[PDB]
Amino acid sequence: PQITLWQRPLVTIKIGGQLKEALLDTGADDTVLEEMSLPGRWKPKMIGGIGGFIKVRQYDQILIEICGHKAIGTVLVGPTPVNIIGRNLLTQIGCTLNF
Amino acid sequence: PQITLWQRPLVTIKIGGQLKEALLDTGADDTVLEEMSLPGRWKPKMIGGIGGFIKVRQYDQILIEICGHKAIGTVLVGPTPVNIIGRNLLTQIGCTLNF
Numbered sequence: 001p002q003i004t005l006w007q008r009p010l011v012t013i014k015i016g017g018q019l020k021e022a023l024l025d026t027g028a029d030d031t032v033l034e035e036m037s038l039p040g041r042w043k044p045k046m047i048g049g050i051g052g053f054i055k056v057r058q059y060d061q062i063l064i065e066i067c068g069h070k071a072i073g074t075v076l077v078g079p080t081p082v083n084i085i086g087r088n089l090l091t092q093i094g095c096t097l098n099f
Numbered sequence: 100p101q102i103t104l105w106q107r108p109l110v111t112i113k114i115g116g117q118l119k120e121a122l123l124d125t126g127a128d129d130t131v132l133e134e135m136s137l138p139g140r141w142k143p144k145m146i147g148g149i150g151g152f153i154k155v156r157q158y159d160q161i162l163i164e165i166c167g168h169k170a171i172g173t174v175l176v177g178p179t180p181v182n183i184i185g186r187n188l189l190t191q192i193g194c195t196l197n198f
């Protein structure tokens with residue numbers, strides 16, 4: 001699908017059997033989701049954004065479906081204002097910027 | 100062109116007669132550049148991202164050239180860690196997300 005940017009590029013993702021809305025964010029290196037429960041052990045990570053840094057929990061090899069496309073990768077969980085699908089997963093679904 | 104997301108989507112922009120490197124950010128509603136001098140009057144604004152909010156100066160009707168494409172829009176100036184080309188300008192150059 002081709003997504004224009006007149007509005008936020010929000011899509012439905014499925015993770016842990018639940019549907020959530022997330023932003024396709026080319027400006028995000030990684031994928032960070034709002035506080036939730038994920039399986040396995042996590043490692044600590046610090047990510048910096050426009051307003052500073054936040055501590056998140058890093059879970060690896062997590063199954064996540066984005067707009068119907070299945071991806072398996074690293075997902076960060078922390079106090080993010082919105083669910084963000086970053087480049088690590090955008091590349092898995094073959095997402096590109098075009099103009 | 101078609102930009103892959105294996106690396107950050109950085110492009111050269113021309114603003115106020117200056118050449119700068121900026122990130123094509125679909126997750127950014129607005130465009131914010133690091134501290135610099137721009138003409139006209141400005142209004143203060145607070146923008147929030149990961150980490151919190153930062154105070155920026157809002158300039159309107161600013162002309163910017165993104166990869167050769169001329170676009171006009173509001174440009175925010177402030178303590179952003181990286182130059183960001185947001186949706187308000189990405190739409191003007193016909194940039195879309197595709198997968």
Ligand SMILES: O=C(N[C@H]1c2ccccc2C[C@H]1O)[C@H](OCc1cccc(F)c1)[C@H](O)[C@@H](O)[C@@H](OCc1cccc(F)c1)C(=O)N[C@H]1c2ccccc2C[C@H]1O
Nearest residue numbers: 027028029030047048049050081126127128129147148180
């Ligand atoms: O922090 C970033 N990447 C980091 C990141 C993100 C997730 C995981 C890892 C990493 C590392 C970095 O790539 C990105 O910023 C560039 C950036 C790039 C590299 C290093 C940096 F410091 C900063 C960031 O994900 C933006 O894509 C965007 O995030 C989603 C969002 C949406 C709505 C409300 C929110 F509050 C947050 C965002 O902050 N948007 C806000 C914005 C920006 C400019 C002007 C106005 C407004 C308002 C709002 O849209």
